[PDB]
Amino acid sequence: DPRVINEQLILDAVKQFNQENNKITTENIILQQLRQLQLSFKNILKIQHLQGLERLEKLQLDNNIIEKIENIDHLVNLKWLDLSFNCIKKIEGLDKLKELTDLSLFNNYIEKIEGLHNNTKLNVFSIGNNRLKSYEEITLYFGYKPRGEEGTNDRPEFKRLQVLNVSGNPFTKDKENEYKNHIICAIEGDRQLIRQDEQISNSYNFTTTDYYQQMQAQEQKEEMDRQTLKKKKDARMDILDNLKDEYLKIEDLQRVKIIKPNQINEEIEKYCGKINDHVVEMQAAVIQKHQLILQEMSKTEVSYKEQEALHEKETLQILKEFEHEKKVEFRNWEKEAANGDAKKEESRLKTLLQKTTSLKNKLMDIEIQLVEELEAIFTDYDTKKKETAWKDIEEIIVLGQKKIEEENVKFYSNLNVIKNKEEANYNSTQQQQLEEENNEEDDEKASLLENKEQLAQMIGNIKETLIDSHTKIILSAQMELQKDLAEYAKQQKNKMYERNRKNISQIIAQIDAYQTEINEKLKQGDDESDHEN
């Protein structure tokens, strides 16, 4: 009989699992705080009633009649997966989960392997005991393909994957153990043993030593590219990436390209190249400024760390002094309680309590000095940043924006000159020939040239729109820098607020504990005076 994994069944499975591993008997098991789920042999026919488990780390559904997989997109934080030995025929629905590492699809109807490009980090995959037809299938997942097939997969999709068994597949019963060697040459001790067979190493060209040297080189290139990307973004000039793509957002440029395509493309290339080089110098200077600003900030946290540590060391020394005070006071308390001289005991105890209030006052004073020091440090650093780094970025952005403006103005002037020359050439030529195949493009050029004022206004609008878009992107980068710095300062100050609140709460709690303990000692010493009458 077909069934469903229901939340009543959910609780039943939770109870069985907790029994299996002696988990705390809590009926109030938070359903948003689930990590591992076992569903051993429920004969489960479908997967349902599991929404909300984005934090899942372990899961098991072996020994069931499940046959289809899909909608596992919402679960992207899974680690331990075991769904083998089911009615599976295809793999899909998991394209969003990258964090899984244990993939079990053993002993199913699996014949096509697909959907694991996103989870390149997988290291365990069981798809053995299947109906798989071709060995080279697996080759597609480790950056190796049979020679002679057009393969657009020039980027390997599985590197750390070192757990993979398909043993028992249909083709795996032919030419014993040759297919394993072939796949491994495209893919732990078994690997060393297979690599030592002469035919295994002779039959291919792309080995593992060279593969790993290339891997290290490629990963170094990737890391340098990522650092360059972060550099450019922190320069805030990333938004200008469409500046050279603006013309493809500028239709009037396409319309005007008809008049003289050759020199139009030539001037466009000159304009793009110069704009690119000077804008690049722009973000390079901005990057220097932002890097020194980052150093400024990091030294800010460093200085806060040293000064704070000084504060806690002084506070801890004073607190150790008062703990010694408490211990001597309690020792004398017990000694005189054996003595029973209540008057002197309570006198020394109020002496201690006044000392405790003194500790409260001095600790609050320490917090006050903390406030002065942190506030002065923050104001000084903010003024330093404003005076040097913020102003340098300001000037660099101003120079870069007006340099882009210089390029735009010169480009517009060159466009004006080319338009005037084309107009003059058309005016000269129109007086000799009046019949040539009624050319469509010739007629379009004639119409564009006749309305010379129309062309002038179109190019002027083109330049004004280009300058406006460039200026708006420039100001968007400037506002990005403004908001970034503002959020930095705001987070630092607010976090200082919560830190101050937390430390004051701790001080109040300790003073309250001291006072309550002192009162307990005094009250017991005094109550010891109520049996003697």
Binding site: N22, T25, E312, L316, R499, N503, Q506
Partner: protein, 150 residues
């Protein structure tokens, strides 16, 4: 690796060679039998083990028969975690004979706490008797020998 960077055992000679406890009948190198008072231990702070879940200091004081364990201070905290736990229910000595003691032992949390404490304390006991034997060997070896030349 363990991160327990400080380890010490208090002593007090105010009681004679108590004749019951094997763990307290110590083949002390110096004189034979000696008697025990307390232990202190200080641990390294792993960045990835929580301060309020990772013990930084601990005190198993026999005179008080209660353990004095310190925990790190959380970010922004100046309230030191000086927990003084009772050792009555530490080795299973807890009396189930009392009908009325709130039976919170069922909680596995108490079970894990006591398992950790017992493991640590017996490990220290055996390691320190071994330290006794090793120190005896070392000092006798460097005492009896004459002087060698190369």
């Amino acid at each position: 690796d363990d991160r327990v960077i400080y380890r010490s055992i208090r002593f007090d000679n105010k009681r004679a060679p108590s004749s019951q406890n094997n763990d307290k009948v110590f083949q002390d190198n110096h004189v034979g039998d000696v008697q025990i008072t307390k232990m202190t231990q200080k641990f390294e702070k792993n960045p990835h083990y929580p301060a309020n879940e990772q013990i930084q200091k601990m005190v198993i004081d026999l005179i008080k028969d209660k353990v004095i364990v310190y925990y790190h201070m959380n970010d922004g905290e100046i309230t030191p975690i000086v927990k003084i736990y009772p050792r009555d229910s530490m080795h299973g000595f807890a009396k189930l004979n009392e009908p009325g003691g709130d039976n919170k032992i069922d909680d596995p949390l108490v079970q894990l706490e006591n398992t950790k404490m017992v493991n640590l304390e017996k490990d220290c006991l055996n390691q320190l008797k071994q330290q006794e034997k090793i120190a005896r060997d070392d000092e006798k070896t460097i005492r009896e020998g004459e002087i060698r030349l190369e």
